[PDB]
Design brief:
The structure is cut from a larger assembly and holds 11 protein chains of 10 kinds.
Chain D (H helix, E strand, L loop, with lengths): L12 E3 L5 E4 L27
Chain E lengths: L1 H22 L12
Chain G lengths: L4 H9 L9 H24 L3 E2 L6 E2 L34 H6 L2 H27 L6 H4 L1 H18 L10 H15 L5 H25 L27 H11 L9 H27 L22 H13 L15
Antiparallel strand pairs in G: 1-2
Classes of the chains: A mainly alpha (37), B mainly alpha (56), C mainly alpha (33), D mainly beta (51), E mainly alpha (35), F mainly alpha (37), G mainly alpha (336), H mainly alpha (30), I mainly alpha (448), J mainly beta (230).
The complex binds digalactosyl diacyl glycerol (dgdg) (3 copies), chlorophyll A (3 copies), 1,2-distearoyl-monogalactosyl-diglyceride, the ligand CCCCCCCCCCCCCCCC(=O)OC[C@H](CO[C@@H]1O[C@H](CS(=O)(=O)O)[C@@H](O)[C@H](O)[C@H]1O)OC(=O)CCCCCCCCCCCCCCC, beta-carotene (BCR) (3 copies), CA-MN4-O5 cluster and 1 more.
One digalactosyl diacyl glycerol (dgdg) sits at the interface of chains I and G.
Organism (chain K): Chlamydomonas reinhardtii
Protein name (chain K): Photosystem II CP47 reaction center protein
Family (chain K): Belongs to the PsbB/PsbC family. PsbB subfamily.
Chain lengths: 37, 56, 33, 51, 35, 37, 336, 30, 448, 230, 101
């Protein structure tokens, strides 16, 4: 029907990519010691 | 007789009906769909005419 | 070589000849085919 | 008779010195005139572990 | 199983009758062509 | 087999089934005669 | 308005503005295919093993019973049933239905009725848009082929066990047992159908190459060549005289179609006629008219038989004749 | 174990076929 | 003669030029009707010419003689041949009479009037004239209404027909009491076509086959008069297409279904196609194997009831899934068989074990040993075994030629249906030539 | 039906109805055993017909009390023995016996338990000879091998035919020996004139062994039976 | 534009999409429970309830069906020490297929 006027855009700049990928790998270093027991 | 069945595959009963409720199911559904078609025939053109088909 | 097998093949020549012979005789004489 | 490269499974045969079938493990055990228990083939080892 | 056989006959003869009474309803004039 | 007054005509009757195949081949002959007008 | 309940309904079925057109074939196609689809998925996953041959050795066909995608199948109806109509209600218990080869005959009857009518609505929409109607003819070439492997072949053999299973490895057994009994590779109808698809693939690789190789320059080189065509345009997107001119140099000038309407007819007519013979092939092989047989055919003087390749193909067939249905045959002929 | 891995990949293919029909890129003319 | 630029139709769709030409089209059907009779006469004389009357008829590669022999010409008890002169007459009768049809097919196609509309008013027809079509329909319904009665009269007055269910071997019997009960006759039509029921192939006695044609003889003489005096009703005007090609495709849908039935009836029915003349059926030759190889235990004396097979099922006799005493092996799929050499061995509970050990006639095994050998499975170059069978014999069954030919002949007519019934529906609408390029109906629709 | 109610039917009037799976029931007869005639009488048309198949199942549950569980039949109508015949000697006080030797004295049958899994056997009372009073004809019979000796596995193995390949249990044991069953009869009603007697039985036999690859199971059978005398 | 953690607040304005999302979350929560049930009844061991019981086997959604009165499988077994006379339509397999449809 009508186009929705609530269309918003999402963005993730490079300095936030680096906090994301460093978050994931570090606690993957943490918890993977426990998953294999 | 360890179990109960139709026992009606090689019998050759007409239309596969063996219980007479099936004949009323065969006919009563048919008459109802006919009844809706016969009423709605008023919209489908009135070809009460000499020659009025999809002719060529 | 039989007399039966020969006359059979003579019989086939005559019919196969009779096909286009109707076409030839109207392609020359009449011209309405 | 050794296994050729192509057959994954080859029926066992016992050729003689000259290359003629003498004993075998058959498929049909019902009719049998060449099976090894009607022949009596024995195995001898030379060295290794069963010397 | 008789309860199931009376149900298939209601289903089939419903859709078979939409077919037969569907093509009778002036299908050859349900075309985009003009005359 | 054929009757004995008819037996000298066995070589002609062994051609007769093939005749209707020659009618469809004639219709291509005739259309070549009119040169596919 | 003044329209009836029925006319409201018929101006919805034949409405050409639905996302998927229904039509009057689709009112009995759609409830048959959704029947046959939803029962095919369940028997491919959870069917208990089926006695296929009547000798009470059930054959597994489910993913839950230790099969993978390739070895999964929907096992055909048992040999003891034969051609008796065996619906779900003639069985006493539901598990007696499953063990005897139940969902094979439920699928095939709804499948074949569904694809006869999918051919129907390919006509029906083409009448609703003013198209010429012969796409429904071209879909009859697989429909002729699928009617033979499911229905025409179990009639001539007398049982739905000899039909083709609904499985990838199930198909491959059906190809082997068939040629062992009927020698399909030495039948000229299978020779036409083989030429129907080797010719059919050649006529698609060759036609599709030349249309790509004659595209008009309209884009850049970083952008794809598919961006030159815009949808619904009127002018032609490739040079046609250049492709006939190319292919005329390639073999000779008489060996090419310049008329593009005569071209696209030839692409339709070549495989469709070719599949019709290989559909009629195993239709005639269903009634036990096998193929060629040149066994012990090349003989010299003094009465000695020379091998040919046809005697080698004999040995393949004779090695598979004595192995299919391994615990069935009590008698030295395979009449069934 | 693999009997549920197979059925993921079967209904996964049927997922795209649902999305490729109804959520297709609509072909706009001209 | 006709060119292309006056009609549009090319040389290969050339017979479509004479749609609107009534008189030329009339010679086209008559000339074709000559060729059907001409094939009937020529192939009959050809098969009589190569006929050895001491060997069985189905062994010699014959399909038209058992059609004549089923009617009961020159045949005696058991299936043997008395004299082959009536087989010579019909081949002579059709062959001379084809030339009479041949002359009229040449005449109207060349010199007779190309449109017999304004000159011969009873014969002239326009394809949209509905009353005239129902006349030309209704005249011919009498012609094959009466043609059904010839089989009826020949079975009740003129010697009868070969009844393969005669006691003590098959024999010609005059049908005296034809079964004309409507509940018995119409029970075949609304019977299921699957196994054990067998839609119309399972008519098992000659009393019904002759009894049926009294109905179909009466009906399209009654129905033939109905279409003469009436026009189609306005629902039939709302349902059909009224052109020339539309009438053809209606017929092609019919005789596509006719081919598939004769495909199946010559494969299964050993009553209208008796096994003494057309050879055994597939189910008959398979059941002949287990019967003859049960005689082969009776001369050795082992217990056929106690003969357990390898799977624990019964080597010789086992139980049907509806609980009946039947044969065993892979021939368990053919337990729906009935035959006159086998039905005198069956009691209530299937075939009787006490009867088979004692009450075997000698002539029954003499027939069930030919049927072991002459099973219909063969090759294409007429070898005649399984595919793993060497070039020894020369036999493929007439049941296998009739079932294969009339499947394929009765298949393309369904492709003939889908051609013309689409084209006649299109050309009546207007767009058989293509899209108009000025107002195509797609451009007037909403998207998606 | 009675005997001549069955015998009046033709083959077309019975095919596909399951009537032929039945043994003839009797209406006219003596309920209280009046006759007590002695001597030799031809045990003819001795056919039985079962009612319920329950198996001695070693329980899923850990408790060591076995039971008999109700089953679902997987074969359609192949379970009735028929046309077994012999002699039925009768004495004076009530000592009588029966000996049968021929006819369809065995019939294969698979059947299903809950939990999904299946179990097969061949239903036989062949070579059975019981003595005693007219309430108990308790005795013993043999059970033949279920498969034959020439039976093949899915991998081409077996005793009479087959190649091979810890797994020596699966090919070197292909047994073709016959075990032993236990059968109990009971005469219920006697006809004095027409010579046809009925009754109730109860039979018990082992199931199947996969040619010696699993321990077999034992099955209770109930039902009715029938026997003529002339 | 949004951050990554405010992406679901496009729904907060209009009512109509908020049903569509709350239906999608409802379809997952049920579809978990249908998947969790079928997964677990395919790895259940009804053999020894006195000593290898239901709880020790390590099991999550099947006691929540048993507590409201589902004690029979389509396989034919029960919990308490018997087998199924008839399971009926509402059994372990049927409730598992009830949530998925
Ligand atoms: C073991 C046994 C099992 C048995 C199973 C049963 C199987 C039965 C198989 C039957 C197969 C027949 C199928 C084809 C039928 C074709 C009907 C048709 O084309 O029909 C076309 C014609 C059209 O009729 C005409 O319809 C016209 C409509 O006019 C209307 O419309 C016109 C324009 O359209 C004008 O506008 C006009 O003003 C307006 O009035 C007029 O009414 C005409 O007078 C009238 O003749 O219909 C008619 O003649 C129809 C005449 C026949 C009707 C038959 C009815 C049978 C009913 C059986 C009992 C059913 C009980 C039902 C109960 C329901 C509740 C539970
Ligand atoms: C050009 C293009 C490129 C080349 C393409 C090649 C294919 C061209 C067309 C093929 C036609 C070839 C005809 C000559 C070969 C032949 O067949 O010659 C064979 C015969 C005659 O030859 C004789 O054929 C006999 C055939 O056996 C017959 O007689 C035997 C006893 O003697 C048995 O009775 C047996 O049942 C019976 O079949 C014997 O084999 C003789 O030894 C042999 O000499 O001619 C015949 O029949 C001729 C056939 C006439 C009937 C044709 C229609 C049949 C319709 C039924 C089948 C449906 C369609 C097929 C479905 C699959
Ligand atoms: C409604 C749904 C119809 C579906 C058709 C299923 C046909 C399957 C079948 O079992 O058909 C067989 C039946 C004959 O049935 C048989 O009938 C026999 C009757 O013989 C018995 O009785 C006879 C009496 O002489 C003989 O004595 C014989 O020995 C004795 O056994 C037996 O009962 C068999 O068990 C029984 O199967 O033929 C027929 O019904 C002929 C009519 C149907 C022909 C269909 C052929 C396939 C066509 C598919 C479409 C083609 C492709 C088109 C795509 C484009
Ligand atoms: C059995 C099949 C059959 C029949 C009966 C016809 C009949 C006809 N066709 Mg068609 N046709 C056919 C097959 C058939 N056709 C096929 C297979 C093709 C494709 C090649 C065509 C293509 C075609 C075209 C393109 C045209 C026709 C036309 C015609 C008509 C006139 C022919 C003509 O001008 O004569 C003149 C022809 C000749 C003089 C040649 C000689 C023909 C004679 C009759 C052969 C004699 C055979 C036999 C030996 C006679 C026995 C003697 C007898 C008295 C005992 C005629 C009604 C024409 C038409 O549209 O009419 C308006 C036309 O233009 N046909
Ligand atoms: C092959 C010859 C032939 C042909 C081509 C036609 C063609 C036609 N007929 Mg005619 N007709 C014929 C033979 C023929 N008929 C015969 C032999 C009779 C006598 C019975 C009739 C009696 C007849 C009547 C009375 C009428 C027609 C009508 C029509 C027209 C429309 C038919 C229609 O809509 O069918 C479409 C098909 C259907 C709607 C369904 C028909 C299925 C029938 C009912 C078979 C079911 C019978 C069943 C087996 C019995 C069950 C028994 C059970 C209870 C035990 C059409 C022009 C009609 C017409 O236009 O009037 C002039 C009309 O009113 N015909
Ligand atoms: C009923 C529950 C519920 C609902 C409907 C909302 C709804 C909302 N919250 Mg709130 N919130 C909730 C619970 C809820 N919240 C809880 C419990 C917390 C504490 C942890 C928060 C903390 C919170 C903050 C801090 C913020 C919101 C924001 C928002 C808004 C946008 C959410 C968004 O963009 O996420 C986008 C989410 C993703 C892109 C993916 C996140 C990935 C998660 C962390 C892990 C993966 C999901 C996991 C596997 C699923 C398991 C579910 C679990 C229940 C079992 C929206 C109004 C935002 C807001 O209001 O700004 C306007 C905001 O800044 N919420
Ligand atoms: C290509 C053409 C091939 C040949 C076509 C002609 C032969 C095929 C048709 C055979 C005769 C069918 C007549 C009715 C037979 C019958 O009633 O069997 C009835 C059969 C089987 O009925 C069974 O009978 C058995 C014996 O008693 C058992 O009792 C079973 O319980 C019972 O189900 O039902 C069906 O096969 C399904 C019918 C549904 C048809 C759907 C198609 C409709 C499409 C639209 C039609 C528009 C017009
Ligand atoms: C039988 C099912 C079995 C299970 C199914 C599992 C499926 C798994 C594979 C899914 C494949 C998805 C591929 C990408 C789809 C796509 O690009 O759509 C693009 C469309 C664009 O539509 C657009 O929508 C627009 C309207 S609006 O702007 O969105 O309001 C409109 O303008 C535009 O024309 C229109 O094109 O995006 C949408 O509108 C809907 C969102 C789709 C993204 C979610 C898909 C993933 C969730 C699936 C369900 C859960 C599955 C769990 C695993 C993820
Ligand atoms: C139209 C046309 C056409 C067609 C034509 C036709 C088709 C015709 C037909 C015709 C015909 C259809 C004919 C027929 C004929 C026949 C005849 C002419 C016969 C004769 C016979 C005889 C001669 C016989 C003899 C004999 C005898 C007596 C017996 C035995 C011996 C003998 C064999 C000697 C076409 C296509 C071309 C096209 C164009 C046109
Ligand atoms: C002799 C004989 C017999 C009998 C037979 C008979 C009696 C028959 C009849 C038959 C019949 C009596 C048939 C009928 C049929 C019908 C039909 C086949 C129908 C069809 C229909 C149609 C085709 C329609 C269509 C349509 C539709 C669907 C819708 C709309 C459109 C139209 C209308 C088109 C018997 C078996 C005894 C024995 C053997 C032989
Ligand atoms: C990370 C993690 C987590 C989370 C998890 C989750 C969140 C899960 C989920 C899961 C899920 C959530 C699953 C689901 C599934 C679903 C399903 C599986 C569904 C299916 C469905 C279907 C398949 C449907 C179908 C259909 C359609 C569509 C149409 C209609 C009909 C039918 C039915 C066919 C947590 C933290 C907690 C912890 C652990 C780890
Ligand atoms: O089913 Mn499937 O494949 Ca007609 O052959 Mn006998 O059966 Mn069975 O073997 Mn070979
Ligand atoms: Cl066999």
């Amino acid at each position: 029907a009508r186009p929705n006027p609530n269309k918003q855009v999402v963005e993730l700049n490079r300095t936030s990519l680096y906090w994301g990928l460093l978050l994931i790998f570090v606690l993957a270093v943490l918890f993977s010691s426990y998953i294999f027991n | 007789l360890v179990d109960e069945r139709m026992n009606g595959d090689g019998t050759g009963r007409p239309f596969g009906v063996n219980d007479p409720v099936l004949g009323w199911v065969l006919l009563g559904v048919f008459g109802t769909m006919w009844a809706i078609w016969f009423i709605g025939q008023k919209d489908l053109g009135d070809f009460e005419d000499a020659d009025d088909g999809l002719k060529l | 070589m039989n007399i039966e097998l020969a006359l059979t093949l003579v019989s086939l020549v005559l019919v196969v000849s009779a096909g286009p012979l109707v076409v030839v005789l109207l392609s020359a004489r009449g011209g309405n085919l | 008779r050794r296994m050729p490269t192509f057959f994954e499974t080859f029926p066992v045969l016992l050729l003689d010195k000259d290359g003629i079938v003498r004993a075998d493990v058959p498929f049909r055990k019902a009719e049998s005139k060449y099976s090894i228990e009607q022949v009596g083939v024995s195995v001898t080892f030379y060295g290794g572990e069963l010397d | 199983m008789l309860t199931l056989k009376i149900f298939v006959y209601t289903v089939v003869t419903f859709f078979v009758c939409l077919f037969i009474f569907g093509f009778l309803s002036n299908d050859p004039a349900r075309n985009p062509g003009k005359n | 087999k054929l009757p004995e007054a008819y037996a000298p005509f066995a070589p002609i009757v062994d051609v007769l089934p093939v005749i209707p195949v020659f009618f469809i081949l004639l219709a291509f002959v005739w259309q070549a005669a009119v040169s596919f007008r | 308005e003044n329209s009836s309940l029925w006319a409201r309904f018929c101006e919805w079925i034949t409405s050409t503005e639905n996302r998927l057109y229904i039509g009057w074939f689709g009112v009995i196609m759609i409830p048959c295919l959704l029947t046959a689809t939803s029962v095919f998925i369940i028997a491919f996953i959870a069917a208990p093993p089926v006695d296929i041959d009547g000798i009470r050795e059930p054959v597994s066909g489910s993913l839950l019973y230790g099969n993978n995608i390739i070895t999964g199948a929907v096992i055909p109806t048992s040999n003891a049933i034969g051609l008796h109509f065996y619906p779900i209600w003639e069985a006493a218990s539901l598990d007696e239905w499953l063990y005897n080869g139940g969902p094979y005959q439920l699928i095939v009857c709804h499948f074949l009725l569904g694809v006869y009518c999918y051919m129907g609505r390919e006509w029906e929409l083409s009448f609703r848009l003013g198209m010429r109607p012969w796409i429904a003819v071209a879909y009859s070439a697989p429909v002729a082929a699928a009617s033979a492997v499911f229905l025409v072949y179990p009639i001539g053999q007398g049982s739905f066990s000899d039909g083709m299973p609904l499985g990838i490895s199930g198909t491959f057994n059906f190809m082997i047992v068939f040629q062992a009994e009927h020698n399909i590779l030495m039948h000229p109808f299978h020779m036409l159908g083989v030429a129907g698809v080797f010719g059919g693939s050649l006529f698609s690789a060759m036609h599709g190459s030349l249309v790509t190789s004659s595209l008009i320059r309209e884009t850049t080189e970083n952008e794809s060549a598919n961006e030159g065509y815009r949808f619904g345009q009127e002018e032609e997107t490739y040079n046609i005289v250049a492709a006939h001119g190319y292919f005329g140099r390639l073999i000779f000038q008489y060996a090419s179609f310049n008329n593009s309407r005569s071209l696209h007819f030839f692409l339709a007519a070549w495989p469709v006629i070719g599949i019709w013979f290989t559909a009629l092939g195993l239709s005639t092989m269903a009634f036990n008219l096998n193929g060629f047989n040149f066994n012990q055919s090349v003989v010299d003087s003094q009465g000695r038989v020379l091998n040919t390749w046809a005697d080698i193909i004999n040995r393949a067939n004779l090695g598979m004749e004595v192995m299919h249905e391994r615990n069935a045959h009590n008698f030295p002929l395979d009449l069934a | 174990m693999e009997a549920l891995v197979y059925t993921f990949l079967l209904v996964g293919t049927l997922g795209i076929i649902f999305f490729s029909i109804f959520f297709r890129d609509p072909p706009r003319m001209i | 003669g006709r060119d292309q630029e006056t009609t549009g139709f090319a040389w290969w769709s050339g017979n479509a030029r004479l749609i609107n030409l009534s008189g030329k089209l009339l010679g086209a059907h008559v000339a074709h009707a000559g060729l059907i009779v001409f094939w009937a006469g020529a192939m009959n004389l050809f098969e009589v010419s190569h006929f050895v009357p001491e060997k069985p008829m189905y062994e010699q590669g014959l399909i038209l003689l058992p059609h004549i022999a089923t009617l009961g010409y020159g045949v005696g008890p058991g299936g043997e041949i008395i004299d082959t002169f009536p087989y010579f007459v019909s081949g002579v009768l059709h062959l001379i009479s084809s030339a009479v049809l041949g002359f009229g097919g040449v005449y109207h196609s060349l010199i007779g009037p190309e449109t017999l509309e304004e000159s011969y008013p009873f014969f002239g027809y326009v394809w949209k004239d509905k009353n005239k079509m129902t006349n030309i329909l209704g005249y011919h319904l009498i012609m094959l209404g009466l043609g059904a009665w010839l089989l009826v009269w020949k079975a009740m007055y003129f010697g009868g027909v070969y009844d393969t269910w005669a006691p003590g071997g098959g024999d010609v019997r005059v049908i005296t009491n034809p079964t004309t009960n409507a509940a018995v006759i119409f029970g075949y039509l609304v019977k299921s076509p699957f196994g054990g029921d067998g839609w119309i192939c399972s008519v098992d006695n000659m009393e019904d086959i002759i009894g049926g044609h009294i109905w179909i003889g009466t009906l399209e003489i009654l129905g033939g008069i109905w279409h003469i005096y009436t026009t189609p009703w306005p629902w039939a005007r709302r349902a059909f297409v009224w052109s020339g090609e539309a009438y053809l495709s209606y017929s092609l849908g019919a005789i596509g279904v006719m081919g598939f039935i004769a495909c199946c009836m010559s494969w299964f029915n050993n009553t209208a196609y008796p096994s003494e003349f057309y050879g055994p059926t597939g189910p008959e030759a398979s059941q002949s194997q287990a019967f003859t190889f049960l005689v082969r235990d009776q001369r050795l004396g082992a217990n056929v009831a106690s003969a357990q097979g390898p799977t624990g099922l019964g080597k010789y006799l086992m139980r049907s899934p509806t609980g009946e005493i039947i044969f065993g092996g892979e021939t368990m799929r053919f337990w729906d068989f009935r035959g006159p050499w086998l039905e005198p061995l069956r009691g209530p509970n299937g075939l009787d074990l006490n009867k088979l050990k004692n009450d075997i006639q000698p002539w029954q095994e003499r027939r069930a040993a030919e049927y072991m050998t002459h099973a219909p499975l063969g090759s294409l170059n007429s070898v005649g075994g399984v595919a793993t069978e060497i070039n020894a014999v020369n036999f493929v069954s007439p049941r296998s030629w009739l079932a294969c030919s009339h499947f394929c002949l009765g298949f393309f007519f369904f492709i003939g249906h889908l051609w013309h019934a689409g084209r006649a529906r299109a050309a009546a609408a207007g767009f058989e030539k293509g899209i108009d390029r000025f107002d195509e109906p797609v451009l007037s629709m909403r998207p998606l | 039906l009675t005997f001549d109610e069955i015998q009046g039917l033709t083959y077309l009037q019975v095919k596909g109805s399951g009537i032929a799976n039945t043994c003839p029931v009797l209406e006219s007869g003596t309920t209280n055993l009046k006759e007590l005639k002695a001597g030799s009488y031809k045990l003819e048309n001795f056919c039985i017909e079962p009612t319920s198949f329950t198996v001695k199942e070693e329980s899923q549950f850990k408790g060591g009390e076995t039971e008999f569980v109700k089953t679902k039949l997987m074969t359609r109508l192949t379970y009735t023995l028929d046309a077994m015949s012999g002699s039925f000697k009768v004495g004076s006080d009530g000592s009588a016996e029966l000996k049968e030797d021929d006819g369809i004295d065995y019939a294969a049958t698979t059947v299903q338990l809950p939990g999904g899994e299946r179990v097969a056997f061949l239903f036989t009372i062949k070579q059975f000879d019981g003595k005693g009073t007219l309430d108990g004809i308790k005795g013993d019979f043999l059970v033949p091998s279920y498969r034959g000796s020439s039976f093949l596995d899915p991998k081409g193995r077996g005793g009479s035919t087959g190649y091979d390949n810890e797994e020596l249990l699966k090919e070197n044991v292909k047994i073709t020996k016959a075990l032993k069953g236990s059968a109990v009869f009971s005469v219920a009603k006697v006809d004095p004139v027409t010579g046809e007697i009925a009754g109730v039985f109860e039979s018990i036999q082992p199931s199947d062994t996969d040619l010696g690859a699993k321990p077999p199971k034992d099955i209770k059978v109930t039902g009715l039976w029938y026997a003529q005398l002339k | 534009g949004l951050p990554w953690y405010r992406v679901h607040t496009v729904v907060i304005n209009d009512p109509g999409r908020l049903i569509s999302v709350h239906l999608m979350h409802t379809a997952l929560v049920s579809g978990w429970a249908g998947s969790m049930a079928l997964f677990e009844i395919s790895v259940f061991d009804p053999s020894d309830p006195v000593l290898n019981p239901m709880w020790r086997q390590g099991m999550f959604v099947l006691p929540f069906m048993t507590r409201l009165g589902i004690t029979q499988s389509w396989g034919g077994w029960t919990i308490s020490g018997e087998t199924a006379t008839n399971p009926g339509i509402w059994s372990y397999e049927g409730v598992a297929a009830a949530h998925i449809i």
